[PDB]
Design an enzyme around this catalytic site. Structure first.
Site, PDB file in Angstrom:
ATOM      1  N   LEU A 291       0.815  -1.210   0.000  1.00 46.84           N
ATOM      2  CA  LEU A 291       0.000   0.000   0.000  1.00 46.84           C
ATOM      3  C   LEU A 291       0.851   1.263   0.000  1.00 46.84           C
ATOM      4  CD1 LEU A 291      -0.137   1.338   3.218  1.00 46.84           C
ATOM      5  CD2 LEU A 291      -1.527  -0.727   3.532  1.00 46.84           C
ATOM      6  N   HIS A 292       2.089   1.185   0.494  1.00 42.65           N
ATOM      7  CA  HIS A 292       3.000   2.321   0.398  1.00 42.65           C
ATOM      8  C   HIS A 292       3.333   2.638  -1.054  1.00 42.65           C
ATOM      9  CE1 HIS A 292       7.358   3.469  -0.083  1.00 42.65           C
ATOM     10  NE2 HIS A 292       6.860   4.552   0.486  1.00 42.65           N
ATOM     11  N   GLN A 293       3.527   1.604  -1.878  1.00 41.83           N
ATOM     12  CA  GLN A 293       3.796   1.814  -3.295  1.00 41.83           C
ATOM     13  C   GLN A 293       2.568   2.309  -4.050  1.00 41.83           C
ATOM     14  OE1 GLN A 293       5.210  -2.040  -4.483  1.00 41.83           O
ATOM     15  NE2 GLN A 293       7.281  -1.712  -3.681  1.00 41.83           N
TER      16      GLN A 293
END
Lengths: 298, 187, 51
Positions: B28-30
Site C-alpha cells: 500500500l506504500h507503493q
C-alpha cells in the site's frame, strides 16, 4: 486380532529435488539456459547472511526434478506381515473406488502454482511456472502455467490442470515412471531481498555449490498443502498433510486426537474395526501414506 | 475521506499474520507513490495497546474516486490469497477522530556518530565520548518491518495512534498512509 | 548369484523408482578385461530366476 505393527515406516513418494535459484529478467525466460545464480554473501548489520538479486534481474529461476514412484500402500518396514497385508487391500479398494483422481488433481494444483516459493509469491505481481515431462531424456510434453489464475485457497478446474491429473495418478498407481522438471518465474522485483532456506554468524543461508538453493523437504511441504478437510474455523486455508494436523504458524494443531479425524485414528479405524471412513475423510489418510513417516506403535 | 474500506487478514498456515501485513503495508506504500495524492488514510480497528498488538484487521479511509482507482490498480494480484476486501462504504456519523504519526527512534548510536563526521570532522573517540551507547531509544509501540527499492536496508516503522478527539482536522497524508496533520475516523 | 549381479539389487532403494537400470560386469585376469558382460536390470525381475 490384527493389531497395529510396532514399526510402520512408509517410503516417501513424490520426491522433490533441491530447488536452486538464479536471477534473470522478464520477457527473456524463453532462453532459460545460462542465467547466473544468486550467491549468498556476508553483510554486517551482528552479522547475518543475505541473498539479493543483481540490478538487472527481477524474476526467479527455481529448478527441481520431481519423481512419482507409486506403491504408496506398500510399507518398507512393517513389523507384522498380516497387518501389512490388510493395508495392501485396504488401499487397493481405494484405487478401485477412484483411481487417485482427486489426489493427483490436488497434487497438480501444488505443481501448477508456485506456492513452493513461500516468500517469493506473496510479494510478486506476476508468477509463471514452466513444467516439462522428461522421458528417456527428452521432453515428452511441456506446460506453461500461471500461478495467478489458480488460487492457493480455492481449487478450481481447468483442462490443462486435468492434464497433470492422469500423469501423476498413473505413476502413483504404479503403472510407469513419471519425471517432471518444474521451472518457476516469479516477478518479486528489481533486486528485492529473498528468503531462502536458512541453515545454522547467527544465521546462515543454504547453498549447494556457489548457488542459493531450497531444501527438498521444504518444497515437499507446500506440495502436501492440500488438507482442507480439517475443522477449518476462522477462514484458514489449506494446510500441509501432517499427522495430528499440526501447523506451527498459528502455534495450534488441528485435527485433535480427542476427535475421530486425525491420521492415526482414521487409519486405525479403517484396518482394525473395518468400517470405512468418509470419502472426504479418507482422502487425507492416503495423503499421509504417500509422504511416508515414522509411524507405528510405541 | 467519508468512505472507508475494511481489510482483514485471512489466516495463513505457513506465515504468521505479522509477516502477512508487512507485505500488505509495503504494497500500500507503493500505491500512494504511483497513484499520487495526499488524502488516503489508514487505521487499525483492532489495535490492542496492552501488548502493542497490531491485530488482524486493517482499515483504509479515502474518497470514493480515490478508492475506485485503489482497487483498480493491479496490486491486488498476488495478494488475493492472504486477504479479502469488503466494499467502500461510508463511515458512521458519530465517529470521534484520532490522528496517526510515524514515530522513529534513534536506536543506533553509531549511525549518529557517522552523521557528525561529515559536519564537524570529529574523531572516532570524540564521538564515542560525546555520544555514549545509552542514547538508543526503545519504543513499546507497534511497528512494521519493510524494505524499499531506493534503500535496501530494512527499517522498522513504528505506527502510533494519537489521542481521540471530537473533530477532524484538514491535513495531508504521507506515502505510508500516516498523517502529516490529517485525521481519520475511529469506529 | 549371477542374477543378483545382473539386476542392481545392491542398489537397494536407488532403483525402486528408476526408469532404466543398466549393469556392466567385467572380468579381470592380468589387469586387462577379458570378457565383458552387459545386462539390463529392468528386464531381469527380482522375483523370477529364469535362464
Amino acid at each position: 486380532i490384527l493389531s497395529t505393527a510396532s514399526v510402520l515406516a512408509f517410503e516417501r513418494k513424490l520426491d522433490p529435488s533441491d530447488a536452486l535459484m538464479s536471477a534473470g529478467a522478464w520477457a527473456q525466460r524463453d532462453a532459460s539456459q545460462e542465467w547466473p545464480a544468486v550467491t549468498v554473501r556476508e553483510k554486517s548489520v551482528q552479522t547475518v547472511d543475505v541473498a539479493n538479486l543483481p540490478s538487472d534481474a527481477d524474476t526467479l529461476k527455481v529448478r527441481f526434478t520431481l519423481r512419482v514412484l507409486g506403491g504408496a500402500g506398500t510399507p518398507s518396514a512393517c513389523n507384522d506381515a498380516a497387518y501389512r497385508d490388510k493395508l495392501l487391500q485396504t488401499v487397493a479398494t481405494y484405487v478401485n473406488d477412484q483411481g487417485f483422481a482427486e489426489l493427483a488433481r490436488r497434487y497438480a494444483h501444488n505443481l501448477a502454482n508456485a506456492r513452493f516459493l513461500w516468500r517469493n509469491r506473496v510479494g510478486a505481481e506476476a508468477v509463471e511456472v514452466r513444467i516439462n515431462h522428461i522421458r528417456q531424456g527428452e521432453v515428452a510434453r511441456a506446460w506453461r502455467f500461471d500461478a495467478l489464475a489458480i488460487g492457493l485457497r480455492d481449487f478450481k478446474a481447468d483442462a490443462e490442470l486435468d492434464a497433470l491429473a492422469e500423469l501423476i495418478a498413473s505413476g502413483l498407481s504404479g503403472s510407469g515412471h513419471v519425471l517432471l522438471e518444474v521451472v518457476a518465474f516469479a516477478r518479486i522485483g528489481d533486486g528485492q531481498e529473498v528468503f531462502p532456506s536458512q541453515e545454522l554468524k547467527s544465521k546462515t543461508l543454504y547453498s549447494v555449490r556457489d548457488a542459493a538453493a531450497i531444501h527438498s523437504q521444504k518444497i515437499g511441504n507446500a506440495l502436501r498443502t492440500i488438507d482442507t478437510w480439517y475443522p477449518d474455523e476462522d477462514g484458514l486455508g489449506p494446510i500441509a498433510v501432517e499427522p495430528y494436523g499440526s501447523v506451527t504458524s498459528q502455534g495450534k494443531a488441528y485435527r485433535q486426537p480427542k476427535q475421530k479425524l486425525d491420521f492415526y485414528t482414521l487409519l486405525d479405524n479403517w484396518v482394525l474395526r473395518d468400517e470405512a471412513p468418509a470419502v472426504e475423510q479418507q482422502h487425507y489418510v492416503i495423503a499421509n501414506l504417500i509422504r511416508g513417516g515414522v509411524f507405528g506403535e510405541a | 475521506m467519508d468512505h472507508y474500506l475494511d481489510i482483514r487478514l485471512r489466516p495463513d498456515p505457513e506465515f504468521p499474520p505479522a509477516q502477512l501485513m508487512s507485505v500488505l503495508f509495503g504494497k500500500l506504500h507503493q500505491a500512494l507513490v504511483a497513484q499520487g495524492g495526499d488524502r488516503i488514510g489508514v487505521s487499525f480497528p483492532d489495535l490492542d495497546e496492552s501488548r502493542s498488538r497490531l491485530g488482524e484487521r486493517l482499515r483504509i479511509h479515502a474518497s470514493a474516486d480515490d478508492l475506485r482507482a485503489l482497487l483498480a490498480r493491479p496490486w491486488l494480484e498476488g495478494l488475493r490469497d492472504h486477504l479479502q476486501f469488503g466494499e467502500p462504504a461510508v463511515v458512521p456519523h458519530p465517529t470521534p477522530y484520532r490522528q496517526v504519526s510515524r514515530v522513529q527512534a534513534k536506536s543506533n548510536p553509531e549511525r549518529l556518530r557517522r552523521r557528525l563526521m561529515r559536519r564537524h570532522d570529529l574523531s572516532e573517540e570524540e564521538a564515542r565520548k560525546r555520544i555514549p551507547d545509552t542514547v538508543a531509544r526503545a519504543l513499546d509501540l507497534p511497528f512494521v518491518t519493510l524494505r524499499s527499492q531506493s534503500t535496501g536496508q530494512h527499517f522498522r516503522l513504528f505506527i502510533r495512534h494519537g489521542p481521540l478527539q471530537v473533530t477532524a482536522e484538514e491535513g495531508g497524508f504521507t506515502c505510508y498512509g500516516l498523517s502529516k496533520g490529517g485525521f481519520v475516523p475511529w469506529f
